[PDB]
Each structure stands twice: as structure tokens, then as C-alpha cells.
């Protein structure tokens, strides 16, 4: 779980169709997103949210939930928030969020 | 004690 492995793994999966992947792999991609969110400073979370909304064509009325996910992944301890996301969100929502994030994460300034 | 995620984004 090095910086190099994280980036290579994110590059690989950013470009995959994950609509039909296995739950075990989808769960691991959620962990990947959580770890990668923690490579951004708090100061960049608003930009990460805005870039996510723009990429996904989401209205500003969806800013608050998108930002909350990034904030709470960033502050997560013991994977508690991450585990809640997995439990409480539907599969389609997890897929959409994960693909979005993996495609923006390497393109944005992290500090 | 329970952890609650926000509602998922709504795509129109």
C-alpha cells in the first residue's frame, strides 16, 4: 500500500467498466478511494467536490452530500464511515461515486 | 455510536 501502488491501481481502475464487477472488488475500490481522499489536504476537499459535481452533471443541490462523503472519508478512523457507506448506499451510487473519484483524483492538485 | 452516511447524490 505504497504511494506508487495506489496511483497505479487508481489509474488502472479509473479506465475500467465496473458496472458488473464482483462485490469483493467493489469493496476494495471503496477502500482505495478512502485512502486516496486522505492524500488531499482538507483545503482541497471543496475543489474535489466541485470537480466531482461538474464531471457528473450534478446540480449544486447535491454539493452538500458529495462534500460530506469526501470530508468524512478524509477524517475516517478505523474505517467506520467507509463501512457505513458500503452498508447504506446502493450499488449503483457506489459505482458512480467511485468511478467519478478515480477519474478526478490524479488530475487535481492535492495541496 | 451508529455512523450514518449522507444520502447518495441524486442524478436527474
Author numbering:
A (entry chain A): 142 to 252
B (entry chain D): 601 to 612
Text lifted from the article:
Viral protein 30 (VP30) proteins are present in all filoviruses and perform several important functions, but homologues are lacking in other negative-sense RNA viruses. Additionally, VP30 binds RNA in the presence of zinc and associates with the viral RNA synthesis machinery, which includes nucleoprotein (NP), VP35, and large (L) protein that contains the enzymatic activities. EBOV VP30 (eVP30) is critical for viral transcription (mRNA synthesis), because it is required for initiation at EBOV NP (eNP), the first gene of the seven gene genome. eVP30 has also been implicated in regulation of co-transcriptional editing of viral glycoprotein mRNAs and in modulation of viral transcription reinitiation. We demonstrate that eVP30 binds directly to eNP.
We generated protein crystals for structure determination using the purified eVP30110–272/eNP600–739 complex. Initial low-resolution diffracting crystals were optimized by in situ proteolysis and resulted in several well-diffracting crystals. In contrast to eVP30/eNP contacts, which are largely similar even though the structures belong to different asymmetric units, the ternary configurations of eVP30 suggest that the eVP30/eNP interaction may not impact eVP30–eVP30 interactions. Residues from eNP that span 600–612 are highly conserved not only across all ebolavirus genus members but also marburgvirus as well. Although PPXP motifs typically form a left-handed turn, in the eNP/eVP30 complex structures, the conformation of this motif does not form the expected polyproline type II helix. Instead, these highly conserved eNP residues make extensive contacts with eVP30 residues in an extended conformation. Although the binding pocket is somewhat shallow, the interaction site displays a shape complementarity (Sc) score of 0.6, which is considered significant. Analysis of the interface reveals that there are seven hydrogen bonds between eVP30 and eNP and a number of hydrophobic contacts, which make up much of the observed total of 1,923 Å2 buried surface area. For example, eVP30 Q203A or R213A or Q229A did not result in loss of binding to eNP WT in the FPA, whereas eVP30 E197A and W230A resulted in a near complete loss of binding. However, our data show that the binding site identified in our structure, which includes residues such as W230, results in complete loss of binding and corresponding loss of activity in viral RNA synthesis.
